[PDB]
Each structure stands twice: as C-alpha cells, then as structure tokens.
Amino acid sequence: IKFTKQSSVASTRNTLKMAQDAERAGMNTLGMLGHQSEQLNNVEGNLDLMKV
Amino acid sequence: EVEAAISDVGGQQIFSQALLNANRRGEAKTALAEVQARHQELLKLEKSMAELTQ
C-alpha cells in the first residue's frame, strides 16, 4: 500500500511538471501568433496601398 | 493459646488491557486499497497529457 502511494506521488509530480511545461509551450506559441498577426496586418496594409 | 493467621481483605489492584474497533480491518480501508486503481488512473492523466504536451 505504501509503495503504491509513493508511485502515485511520483506520477503526480511528473504530471504537474510536464503539464506546466505544456502551459509554457502554448503560451509562447500564442505570443508568437500575435506577433505574426501584427506582421500580417502590415502585409495587408501594404497590399491595399499597392492595389491603389 | 492464640495469635495471628490470615488477614487483609480491603486491598487489591488491577491492570487493564484493550482491544480495538473491527471496521479498522486491514490497513487498506478507503484511501489505501483504492490507491492501486487510483494510480492507474493517474498514470492515464500523465500519458494523455504526455500526448497533450507532445
């Protein structure tokens, strides 16, 4: 019973760690997508001016 | 003629032992025996979220 509990504790530790790391991965992805959104807004503006 | 021979009465002491609740049963009783199947579930979260992070 004690061993199984220890295994559960270790597994929850790993789960929390690598979950937090996934949080990071998605976060920097979103900041990055906002950056590229701004860049594409510039692209769109240049294309409009070019149409005129 | 006479003298002493057997005497006392009002004088004795006793220790006291003790058993324990039955329900107690084996240590495995709620949050003990369930930790076997709760671990497989937790290994499932670990895995499914390994898929998530990958």
Curated annotation (Swiss-Prot), chain A:
Disulphide linkage map: none
Domain t-SNARE coiled-coil homology: residue ranges: 2-52
N-terminal signal peptide: none
Record's function text: Component of a SNARE complex that may be the effector of SEC4 function in exocytosis.
UniProt record similarity statement: Belongs to the SNAP-25 family.
Subunit structure of this chain's protein: Interacts with SRO7 and SRO77.
Name of the protein in question: Protein transport protein SEC9
Natural source organism: Saccharomyces cerevisiae (strain ATCC 204508 / S288c)
Gene: SEC9
Full-protein interval shown: 433 to 484 of 651
From Swiss-Prot, chain B:
Gene from which the chain derives: SSO1
UniProt family annotation: Belongs to the syntaxin family.
Note: Present with 450 molecules/cell in log phase SD medium.
Portion of the parent chain present: 159 to 212 of 290
Subcellular location: Membrane
Annotated function: Required for vesicle fusion with the plasma membrane.
The protein's name in its UniProt record: Protein SSO1
